[PDB]
Design a protein around this ligand. Structure first.
Ligand SMILES: O=C[C@H](O)[C@@H](O)[C@H](O)[C@H](O)COP(=O)(O)O
Ligand SMILES: O=C[C@H](O)[C@@H](O)[C@H](O)[C@H](O)COP(=O)(O)O
Lengths: 517, 517
């Protein structure tokens, strides 16, 4: 039964007419604050500030059943062909980023999923061997890569920077804009630098242009070049070449780029920065959420609940965006990665059966950290014309151990308290005789908290959102795991290269070129 | 005549029923590419890829007249009381960020505007005197401040980093999250560090907690403390204290935080990084756009056209967001600042007359750089269910002089060509027999280009968006220049401090606190 044809969706459309009024006096009771929460796998998740009541949550639970979300999650994790469009040409392959960490806890994986799990284990032990030497010889790592090859690793590197002692200097060169390469080359000692070229296909324009820029810089300084370059690419890729790289690590075709941070795409840079054992802790955190995401009761399942609350906000209440708001300096780059992972996966408008859909899929994912956000665009959340649902992320304790007692509390406490106060304020609002000072409220939010950001918790948070977006795709019935819009971008890049050294831009591009130059 | 009561808006509502079809064969003609462009003040602006035709642009021009946008811009720049709500308590003051740079070109300013202009000139010469010494004594500057006191300066600092030689190390400490302070303290030599505390009010929790954290670090290392701390604050503020700071610079009450990057809020950090003359070039670029924004014909006026095209997309076509996409590493932080400046200014739902409005104001402002964006959320722009209007920003040349010829073109060229190809692709789309590979098109965008990012161009780009948002506020008839939502945030912060050492969160905050800990 397709998305719109499920009985539970029909019930939810009636409920969406009159969602609970979070501004009614006494609505945010102790009972509701206790009931609408879940504490498991090192987190507490509170959603008393979402516009949901027990009737709504029973039907959302029915929706997960009618759409068989748990069965699809198993199928994905066990190795079924989830990346495909029936009736038409498509990639037609499994979706196996969970298998890149499944091997750190005993599991019964078969066929393609088992092969990915054992190859990941073989890669990781090759990484441990490699890092013993590399962390002794190099002070500096430069990751060349774009999209899924940069954002996940970069978000995870800054997430862990506060927990793991390290003297390594770490840079990311991604844009074909050569100013990106120049800013990094300005800063580094090449003799001390390990360059990690990360490209699944091995053929993306940006890593290839950037790698060539760095190869020339080594040759200009008169340094042996191959001794400094490591590749991370798909097996059998044009880049899978041990005569051109000091070492070569592999992912595989069933490892989506935007899901590859737990593969060697993240393993090399994270392992070099913080040491092997920290990367394993990161993997254990992800694998623990992989196992938890099979929990059948929505109310007892973090990614499944977050997915269905998102579906409530997006399709039933009609809000076209979601703001992710981490109260966490370490998570400064996490929203940018989530924005790719959610919008690239679920920014689709055809079903896995090839039919054009009549509902909306991925919302715009955007956001920034607190408390900074309270001084800027929170103005519009509190008093603008459009409701923006918020996902707050916070921690009870800082990573780096520096804090200060002022007026009876530490700044870690002030940080968390600000998050709580804003969620309550967004949900309840404030009357006022002055219209300039009134707050209508009923702007929904959830709160996810762990004790402290760590490698393990970073891994759990990553896997949490990976499965949230997968569950939303499974519910919508779309293919979350290809990206024909991004393939088109790479094809445009090939053609504009040929045009500057036929296709439907050419006549347009030429005339634009004349008016802009 | 209010927004909805203007005749031209009535005409535009009829036109919005059937906007031009950018996917119709031959629609993006040479005539249309020439006609729908504007090249002035060092930029070219192309909007042939917006869903507008001559009928629509004539009526939008009528809308600027009926709403008297040019007269309101003059009033703002000349010093009139634009920050006020009639009928109710409000801040009731002028809006004079333009006067902080007006003094670099001859002008006829009177009364409050003239006073701000001459005090800005007096501040700048005090800055030049100060920088001669400070750039000789310190290698490192740390800006402590949040919101308008950080984002604008930070966006401008990275914008200019590629053009101006500098050995200064520059950090921003903003969040009350003490991990922010800790990451910076981990990196700097305090004896070599100048700490610039930037806070207009002088009372915001975050700068005050952070300044105290840094004062203790100096005292722990046993260093003379006052010799290293500079203040930037409103005149007569609690911080305006030459016995507590090595030096004190001023802005004034009519200088909005989100418009303060051209005041000493940006002047100190920019002047220290790149030298005085670079800050003056930045001011000249802004002042040049201030003068240009008085041009009465919408089609001959960059910020007025961009504002009205935004109003077309937001209110007439109904798109609730705008993506700002800079093809520019130097502009990596520009979208975050624009997001504050637009959403905090225009995230309002009452008129300057105190009436609740019946239309939508600020959209969500979000985005990231190209070409990275082509590999991530551009998937949703090309094939998701919701139209997102795009503002592309690009340059013909890189800042840092490093580039490479590959297959007949430089990477600067590949960078620009990718931008052009994507705008055309978003507007025209692509049919396909395979539904997974078809692109519906008609997704609108504009293109703003300068020869090269520079201090001057950075200043023009900043002023461009400041006036875009002002023109949109003038058109909507809202007060763009206060922020009662942000005042509420600071009030919540005061109260949660007292609660941890009455108000409508208290009972809610306590029970949340129990469920999350
Ligand atoms: O799922 C991720 C997307 O396909 C995209 O972001 C991809 O990661 C980049 O285009 C880099 O691709 P390569 O790793 O193949 O260079
Ligand atoms: O217009 C800007 C806003 O009011 C807000 O972003 C403000 O800049 C910060 O709250 C910092 O305020 P202070 O500069 O007064 O510390």
């Amino acid at each position: 039964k397709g998305f719109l044809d499920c009985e539970s969706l029909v019930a939810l459309q009636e409920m969406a007419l009159h969602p609970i009024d979070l501004t009614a006096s006494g609505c945010l009771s102790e009972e509701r604050i206790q009931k609408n929460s879940l504490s498991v796998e090192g987190f507490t998740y509170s959603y008393a500030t979402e516009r949901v009541d027990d009737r709504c949550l029973e039907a959302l639970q029915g929706l997960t059943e009618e759409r068989e979300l748990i069965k699809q999650m198993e199928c994905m994790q066990q190795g079924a062909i989830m990346n495909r469009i029936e009736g038409f040409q498509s990639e037609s392959r499994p979706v196996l980023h969970t298998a890149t960490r499944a091997w750190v806890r005993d599991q019964d994986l078969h066929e393609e999923a088992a092969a990915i799990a054992r190859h990941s284990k073989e890669e990781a032990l090759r990484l441990a061997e490699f890092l013993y030497i590399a962390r002794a010889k190099f002070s500096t790592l430069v990751q060349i890569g774009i999209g899924g090859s940069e954002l996940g690793p970069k978000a995870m590197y800054f997430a862990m920077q506060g927990s793991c002692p390290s003297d390594k200097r770490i840079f990311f060169v991604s844009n074909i804009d050569p100013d990106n390469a120049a800013e990094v080359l300005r800063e580094i000692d090449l003799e001390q630098t390990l360059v990690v070229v990360v490209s699944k296909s091995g053929t993306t324009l940006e890593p290839a242009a950037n790698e060539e820029l760095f190869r020339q810089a080594y040759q200009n300084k008169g340094l042996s070049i191959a001794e400094h370059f490591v590749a991370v690419t798909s097996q059998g890729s044009p880049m899978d070449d041990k005569s051109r790289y000091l070492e070569v690590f592999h992912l595989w075709d069933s490892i989506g780029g935007r899901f590859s941070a737990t593969s060697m795409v993240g393993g090399v840079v994270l392992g070099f920065a913080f040491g092997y054992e920290a990367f394993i802790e990161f993997l254990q955190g992800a694998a623990a959420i992989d196992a938890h995401a099979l929990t059948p009761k929505m109310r007892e399942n973090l990614p499944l609940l977050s997915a269905m609350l998102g579906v409530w906000n997006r399709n039933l209440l009609g809000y076209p965006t979601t703001a992710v708001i981490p109260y966490s300096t370490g998570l400064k780059y996490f929203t940018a990665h989530l924005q790719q992972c959610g919008m690239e996966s679920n920014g689709k408008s055809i079903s896995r059966e090839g039919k054009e859909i009549s509902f909306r899929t991925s919302p715009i994912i955007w956001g920034d950290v607190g408390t900074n956000c309270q001084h800027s665009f929170f103005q519009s959340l509190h008093q603008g014309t459009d409701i923006v649902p918020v996902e707050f992320i916070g921690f009870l304790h800082n990573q780096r151990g520096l804090d200060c007692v002022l007026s009876g509390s530490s700044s870690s406490q002030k940080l968390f308290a600000n998050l709580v106060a804003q969620s309550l304020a967004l949900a309840q609002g404030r009357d006022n005789a002055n219209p300039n000072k009134r707050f209508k409220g009923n702007s929904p939010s959830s709160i996810l908290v762990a004790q402290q950001l760590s490698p393990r918790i970073a891994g759990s948070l990553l896997a949490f959102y990976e499965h949230k977006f997968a569950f939303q795709g499974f519910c919508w019935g779309i293919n979350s795991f290809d990206q024909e819009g991004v393939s088109l971008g790479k094809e445009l890049a090939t053609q504009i290269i040929g045009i500057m050294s036929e296709f439907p831009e050419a006549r347009g591009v030429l005339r634009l070129f004349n008016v802009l130059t």
